[PDB]
Design a protein around this ligand. Sequence first.
Ligand SMILES: *[C@@H]1O[C@H](CO[C@@H]2O[C@@H](C)[C@@H](O)[C@@H](O)[C@@H]2O)[C@@H](O[C@@H]2O[C@H](CO)[C@@H](O[C@@H]3O[C@H](CO[C@H]4O[C@H](CO)[C@@H](O)[C@H](O)[C@@H]4O)[C@@H](O)[C@H](O[C@H]4O[C@H](CO)[C@@H](O)[C@H](O)[C@@H]4O)[C@@H]3O)[C@H](O)[C@H]2NC(C)=O)[C@H](O)[C@H]1NC(C)=O
Ligand SMILES: *[C@@H]1O[C@H](CO[C@@H]2O[C@@H](C)[C@@H](O)[C@@H](O)[C@@H]2O)[C@@H](O[C@@H]2O[C@H](CO)[C@@H](O[C@@H]3O[C@H](CO[C@H]4O[C@H](CO)[C@@H](O)[C@H](O)[C@@H]4O)[C@@H](O)[C@H](O[C@H]4O[C@H](CO)[C@@H](O)[C@H](O)[C@@H]4O)[C@@H]3O)[C@H](O)[C@H]2NC(C)=O)[C@H](O)[C@H]1NC(C)=O
Ligand SMILES: *[C@@H]1O[C@H](CO[C@@H]2O[C@@H](C)[C@@H](O)[C@@H](O)[C@@H]2O)[C@@H](O[C@@H]2O[C@H](CO)[C@@H](O[C@@H]3O[C@H](CO)[C@@H](O)[C@H](O)[C@@H]3O)[C@H](O)[C@H]2NC(C)=O)[C@H](O)[C@H]1NC(C)=O
Ligand SMILES: *[C@@H]1O[C@H](CO[C@@H]2O[C@@H](C)[C@@H](O)[C@@H](O)[C@@H]2O)[C@@H](O[C@@H]2O[C@H](CO)[C@@H](O[C@@H]3O[C@H](CO)[C@@H](O)[C@H](O)[C@@H]3O)[C@H](O)[C@H]2NC(C)=O)[C@H](O)[C@H]1NC(C)=O
Ligand SMILES: *[C@@H]1O[C@H](CO)[C@@H](O)[C@H](O)[C@H]1NC(C)=O
Ligand SMILES: *[C@@H]1O[C@H](CO)[C@@H](O)[C@H](O)[C@H]1NC(C)=O
Lengths: 296, 296
Amino acid sequence: DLPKFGELLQNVTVPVSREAVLQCVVDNLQTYKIAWLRVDTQTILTIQNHVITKNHRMSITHAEKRAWILRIRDVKESDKGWYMCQINTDPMKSQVGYLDVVVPPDILDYPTSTDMVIREGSNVTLKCAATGSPTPTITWRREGGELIPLPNGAEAVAYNGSFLTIAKVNRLNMGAYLCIASNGIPPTVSKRVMLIVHFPPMIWIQNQLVGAALTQNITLECQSEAYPKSINYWMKNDTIIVPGERFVPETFESGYKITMRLTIYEVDIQDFGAYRCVAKNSLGDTDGAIKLYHIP
Amino acid sequence: DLPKFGELLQNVTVPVSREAVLQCVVDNLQTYKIAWLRVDTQTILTIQNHVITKNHRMSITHAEKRAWILRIRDVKESDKGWYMCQINTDPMKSQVGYLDVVVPPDILDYPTSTDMVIREGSNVTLKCAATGSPTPTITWRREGGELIPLPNGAEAVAYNGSFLTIAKVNRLNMGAYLCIASNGIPPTVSKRVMLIVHFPPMIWIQNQLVGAALTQNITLECQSEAYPKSINYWMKNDTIIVPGERFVPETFESGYKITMRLTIYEVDIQDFGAYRCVAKNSLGDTDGAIKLYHIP
Ligand SMILES: *[C@@H]1O[C@H](CO[C@@H]2O[C@@H](C)[C@@H](O)[C@@H](O)[C@@H]2O)[C@@H](O[C@@H]2O[C@H](CO)[C@@H](O[C@@H]3O[C@H](CO[C@H]4O[C@H](CO)[C@@H](O)[C@H](O)[C@@H]4O)[C@@H](O)[C@H](O[C@H]4O[C@H](CO)[C@@H](O)[C@H](O)[C@@H]4O)[C@@H]3O)[C@H](O)[C@H]2NC(C)=O)[C@H](O)[C@H]1NC(C)=O
Ligand SMILES: *[C@@H]1O[C@H](CO[C@@H]2O[C@@H](C)[C@@H](O)[C@@H](O)[C@@H]2O)[C@@H](O[C@@H]2O[C@H](CO)[C@@H](O[C@@H]3O[C@H](CO[C@H]4O[C@H](CO)[C@@H](O)[C@H](O)[C@@H]4O)[C@@H](O)[C@H](O[C@H]4O[C@H](CO)[C@@H](O)[C@H](O)[C@@H]4O)[C@@H]3O)[C@H](O)[C@H]2NC(C)=O)[C@H](O)[C@H]1NC(C)=O
Ligand SMILES: *[C@@H]1O[C@H](CO[C@@H]2O[C@@H](C)[C@@H](O)[C@@H](O)[C@@H]2O)[C@@H](O[C@@H]2O[C@H](CO)[C@@H](O[C@@H]3O[C@H](CO)[C@@H](O)[C@H](O)[C@@H]3O)[C@H](O)[C@H]2NC(C)=O)[C@H](O)[C@H]1NC(C)=O
Ligand SMILES: *[C@@H]1O[C@H](CO[C@@H]2O[C@@H](C)[C@@H](O)[C@@H](O)[C@@H]2O)[C@@H](O[C@@H]2O[C@H](CO)[C@@H](O[C@@H]3O[C@H](CO)[C@@H](O)[C@H](O)[C@@H]3O)[C@H](O)[C@H]2NC(C)=O)[C@H](O)[C@H]1NC(C)=O
Ligand SMILES: *[C@@H]1O[C@H](CO)[C@@H](O)[C@H](O)[C@H]1NC(C)=O
Ligand SMILES: *[C@@H]1O[C@H](CO)[C@@H](O)[C@H](O)[C@H]1NC(C)=O
């Protein structure tokens, strides 16, 4: 009888630089001969245990009589396509299989965004592009799973698309953003973009009117938000307040927030008047008004 | 340097059963290797001096370092197509050429006409079909270069087309017809058709009135055309004339024509009267009237 393939030639799918192993099997080969050969380029590759193509990445093995195994190391995209296992017969017998090569995902340095910095109330567009086969899918997230403002006013945890535009950025939008590019092949990779925001400081004051008697210890207080962090000092009569045992100012800073106090000890009659808490940063300055008055 | 073809791979064209010789040449082959292989069927054939395909009609020769000559004996139509000469290189180098197989011409036994026979005044259609590649061209002629009646009433020496129709055949159309089928490849062949015609006889008479005196020798004469040839006898008084020394009838036949005489020696007075020349064949009979009368 004539030889015939023992098991169909199977589809393979390999990543770049890896090794590809294509396996052809034949029952009862007698004195006939097997040949591998790329189809598209119509190029002979191997015959029996002898390799033809000078392409040194290709190799044949005859470990068992059944299997004639073709091996392609350091695989490349050019190598992918159709491959034929052929048996010298009249007529000739051949089964054919496909090798799909695949590339992991990669994020580019351009136009991929870097650590960007924009003023509050402004615009931005965190771009991210990546290469891959299959053409990868890009997804944005935030390190603390924070929200991501959407163009409709709603907000979610993961936005798709290479280009993400935020309108009128807010100090809450500030944080660590992650571009994630997955092609479905390991290892998926991601780049960390830093969105920092600066804003002219602003001052809130709980009690703009506080009273005190003599010999009592009282503390004024304001609340500011400034980035970069703001220099916060007290004023009275259009003059700086330097702590002189009787009056001591403090500041308690947390991120862009700042809570400043001016603790007045043993209130004197000359202390009463109009105070001001001022805040100043690279983008402007601001102040508030607190009035200290008498009890009786 | 790398090898390269010395002379382009040339187009061949061969007839069936013959031998085909395809010649590939390469300059500076070093340790590389040549391979022949059919393109369409993607089938490897030969490599170096070793033949792969079990097709025993194929053979490689390395007579000179230049030429790697592939030889295909007892060529068949299935063999024709594209053939590639390949050199194992990375990338691979290959030049390709076409083998066109050709078949001489042949006339079939059917529906090819045979020796046909039709009555005069009737129709006929001398058919002739032939096979060949290129599809051959059929031409009709006549052995004596005679004319060939055309459907418009005109006449020529050679008509094209497989089917030739003659309307109301005439005895002049009778003769040897030749079907000729040429494909442009030797040896062109031709079949000889025989067109025979039968016709009820007809009689012409030059002198329907002849006079004679006594003791004179006179000869009557008619002219007939009959096919198949007609039996021509003389009549007088509704009775057959059998030669009895005084009267002797003759016949001079040429093809379908016949010229009959009745030579009367020493005319008697009882001889004068009404004679008749009769002609009879398979398709009917006919006669004429000659009156013999006196001089004084
Ligand atoms: C082994 O894999 C073979 C290759 O497939 C690749 O590898 C696998 C592992 C996956 O990664 C896969 O995603 C890859 O594509 C595989 O061959 C594939 O088989 C399918 C189905 O048989 C083919 O789909 C058909 O493709 C044809 C032609 O498309 C080509 O030509 C056009 C130009 O004309 C190009 O633009 C394309 O990009 C392609 O190159 C289509 O005509 C056809 O659609 C028609 O037929 C269907 C019904 O069958 C109708 O419903 C439609 O309306 C059309 O009328 C299909 O789309 C696919 O093309 C083919 N891949 C390649 C590269 O040719 C093979 O099947 C696998 N074998 C085994 C044993 O697993
Ligand atoms: C060696 O011979 C090759 C084969 O030629 C045969 O063998 C020779 C010895 C002769 O006997 C000859 O009569 C045989 O045909 C020869 O290849 C031939 O090259 C010519 C010209 O290069 C080709 O003509 C072109 O064919 C294409 C495709 O036609 C095929 O496909 C259609 C279906 O799509 C089929 O129906 C046909 O039957 C064919 O199978 C046409 O598209 C093309 O026309 C177009 O291009 C021209 C301009 O080039 C335009 O003007 C037109 O309008 C069209 O846009 C031509 O008609 C011929 O097909 C091809 N033969 C074969 C079998 O493919 C080769 O060139 C020779 N080489 C040398 C070195 O001598
Ligand atoms: C800062 O960003 C805002 C809004 O941000 C973006 O706005 C859209 C263009 C989309 O990209 C959104 O996905 C995204 O959130 C910009 O305001 C927007 O400006 C465009 C351009 O003028 C407006 O488009 C207009 O649409 C009308 C139809 O209603 C057309 O007739 C116009 O011709 C024009 O195309 C868009 O409506 C507007 N959106 C909002 C919410 O204001 C803003 O321009 C941008 N800053 C700068 C300097 O460009
Ligand atoms: C014997 O042969 C004659 C003529 O021979 C052939 O006539 C043509 C049909 C062509 O094949 C010629 O190449 C060839 O010499 C036959 O007489 C022909 O008969 C046909 C069929 O009736 C006539 O065709 C007609 O044409 C008119 C248009 O004028 C149409 O309206 C009709 O419907 C019909 O198709 C043809 O004119 C006629 N030709 C002559 C010269 O008489 C004859 O029929 C044939 N014998 C038999 C028994 O068929
Ligand atoms: C886009 O993101 C949304 C939110 O997770 C999800 O529903 C959708 O499937 C995503 N689209 C793609 C193509 O992944
Ligand atoms: C048909 O015959 C005529 C008469 O000889 C000739 O002119 C013509 O070239 C012929 N046609 C072909 C295709 O040979």
